[PDB]
């Protein structure tokens, strides 16, 4: 039975929810006519519709996430989730733009090197972590003023092994000083190794969950992996509220 | 993760239909494919007929054939707990060896989020979104007696497409025109994935890679499948020490 009750989530797992993001009918429309026109560019709700209820809900979520990051003395924020299809791309990109709009210098990173498609909203991480590219080539300017971006890059055959290396942590330390926040869209926590990976990013970590998509045991499994790996799991983000 | 195959059959009453060694030649061929700016994956069963892994797969091929005719079903499904287990490698090599045994085989890449099987040679996504007819989606490969449906272009709604009425209707017809329909299904990450695999209505096998899975991760995958009503015949233990 898919979980839709946010109160049930907070009490069952001691997971404070940093935001309730409604299912945007305007986002569904934008998605529909981009998939109809054969668009290779996903729209950014935050840039196109500043008054949308999901966007106002995202503005709230952003301030709360900033405070959490500052309390934890971090410069990296990590979004994860139990599975794909939960709105982790939508959230990470809209959050990055709102942080950039607030006045912050933001670095967005697509760390899902098996299915990351954050480039669609605008070499990448796979090359940088393979030493096929230097940092100054991987870091790209975005249409959005103040937002810089590192795509997932060419799909590698060893994405897990690349994220387990010394290089990612060491790049993140420098990038955390050159940018106000480093926002990472990480791969979903399917297994122990996924949790270890997210631990190495060492940022304020938020578990994305979509309404009606997860069973109680499914949420429990993701939380237990993150928590047993020693990840800084600040709280959750509940997405697609009807 | 778990290395001992005896612990797997004992702990989950999951009889292993095959033990497939880590093939050193496959490792070499992947390295060689990687370094060369190549857009194709080498089929081991084609290139190395007496590779120990290919030899273990002919044993597996026969066991699955007995399974599917006892079940009076010409749909075979492979699933797994996560990516990186060798499900692509096993399905394509099992498809080729079944063709070599003199069967008309249809291989379907149902994993529409990654869709890699076409690298070994319109697809499923265009078929289930009514953009293509079955006639245009089914392709004849360079392997004689082997036909193939690719993943197709990555859709925004993969689970929605696999949960549509079209999938089982198409499989009903294709099962009458081929001796074997072999499906590379998405991994069983949640009950929704187990339902989709249940609608495929085939003799189903759980792929597990040596040293990758905890006892809990294996248990979750099996539980999702058994509770969704899936005909889980047994498992395939891949990457064992040669
Ligand atoms: N709150 C929402 N309102 C409307 N559409 C949404 C919402 N959240 C996600 N979506 C849509 O659902 C789909 C899946 O979201 P996405 O971020 O791509 O998933 P993933 O978690 O795999 O990154 C996309 O088409 C996205 O635009
Ligand atoms: N038994 C094996 N011996 C050697 N290499 C293997 C074996 N099984 C899989 N591989 C390799 O491991 C990688 C991952 O396997 P693949 O089938 O692509 O994973 P997935 O489960 O995500 O489909 C590939 O490069 C594949 O060729």
Residue-wise DSSP of B141-190: -SSTTEEEE---SPPS-HHHHHTSSHHHHHHHHHHHH-SEEEEEPPP--S
What is the distance between the alpha carbons of residues A84 and B79, in angstroms, rounded to a whole number? 17
Kindly report the backbone phi and psi dihedral angles of residue B164, in degrees, each rounded to the nearest multiple of 5, phi listed first: -70, 165
The pairing of strands A181-185 and A140-141 is unpaired
What are residue A121's phi and psi, to 5 degrees?
A: -75, -15
Residue B46: exposure state from Cβ atoms within 10 A (0-12, 13-18, ≥19):
middle
Which residues share a beta bridge with B204?
B77, B232
Q: Answer whether B86 touches A (CB < 8 Å).
A: no
CB contact A160 to B (< 8 Å): yes
CA distance A116 to A109: 10
- The four Cα atoms A45, A46, A50, A56 give a dihedral, to 10 degrees, of 100
Q: Which domains does chain A have, with CATH numbers?
A: 6-239 (3.40.50.300)
Nearest Cα residue to atom 27 of ligand 2: B89
- What sign has the CA pseudo-torsion A171, A175, A177, A183? negative
Tokens of B193: 């994935």
Resolution in A: 1.9
SS3 B16: strand
User: Helix (H, G, I), strand (E, B), or coil: what is residue A195?
Assistant: helix
Q: Which chain B residue lies closest to A132 (C-alpha atoms)?
A: B35
What is d(CA A120, CA A93) in angstroms, rounded to the nearest whole number?
10
CB contact, 8 Å: B123 with chain A? no
**B212 reaches A (C-beta below 8 A):** yes
Percentages helix, strand, coil for chain B (3-state, rounded to 5) are 45, 20, 35
Classified as helix, coil or strand, B209 is: strand
Q: Is residue B93 a known part of a binding site?
A: no
Q: Whose atoms come closest to the Cα of A49: which ligand?
A: 1
Which technique was the structure solved with, according to the deposited record? X-ray
Which is the closest atom of ligand 2 to the Cα of B29? 27
Residue B75 structure tokens: 């749909």
Q: Taking every pair of C-alpha atoms in chain B, what is the biggest distance, in angstroms?
A: 47
Report the candidate in B238, B242, B232, B239 with the shortest Cα–Cα distance to residue B13.
Answer: B232
A211 lines ligand 1 (CB under 6 A): no
Burial class of residue B164 (count of CB atoms within 10 Å of its CB; 0-12, 13-18, 19+): middle
Q: Which residues contact A58 (CB under 8 A, 6 or more apart)?
A: A19, A21, A46, A91, A94, A95, A98
Backbone angles phi, psi at A136, to 5 degrees: -65, -15
β-strand partners of A204: A77
Cα separation, B70 vs B68, whole angstroms:
6
With beta carbons less than 8 A apart as the criterion, state whether B187 and B82 touch. Answer: yes
Among A83, A152, A164, A214, the residue to mutate for chain B (most B Cβ within 10 A): A83
A to B CB pairs, distance under 8 Å: 44
């Amino acid at each position: 039975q898919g979980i839709e009750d946010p109160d049930r989530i907070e009490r069952a797992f001691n997971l404070p929810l940093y935001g309730l993001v409604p299912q945007s009918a305007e986002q569904v429309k934008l998605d529909a006519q981009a998939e109809k026109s054969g668009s290779r560019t996903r729209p950014i709700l935050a840039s196109l519709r500043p008054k949308d209820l999901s966007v106002e809900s995202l503005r709230s979520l952003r301030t709360a996430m900033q405070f959490a990051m500052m309390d934890a003395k971090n410069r990296v924020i990590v979004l994860t989730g139990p599975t794909p299809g939960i709105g982790k791309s939508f959230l990470t990109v809209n959050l990055a733009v709102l942080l950039a709009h607030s006045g912050k210098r933001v670095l967005l990173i697509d760390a899902d090197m098996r299915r990351g498609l954050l480039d669609r909203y605008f070499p990448g991480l796979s090359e940088l972590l393979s030493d096929q590219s230097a940092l100054e080539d991987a870091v790209r300017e975005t249409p959005v003023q103040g937002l810089s971006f590192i795509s997932a890059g060419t799909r590698p055959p060893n994405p897990s092994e690349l994220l387990m290396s010394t290089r990612l942590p060491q790049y993140l330390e420098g990038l955390g000083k050159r940018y106000d926040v480093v926002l990472i869209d990480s791969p979903p926590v399917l297994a122990v190794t996924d949790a270890t990976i997210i631990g190495r990013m060492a940022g304020s970590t938020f578990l994305v969950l979509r309404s009606g998509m997860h069973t109680e045991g499914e949420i429990a499994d993701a939380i237990k992996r993150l928590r047993t790996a020693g990840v800084d799991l600040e709280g959750g983000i509940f997405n697609g509220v009807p």
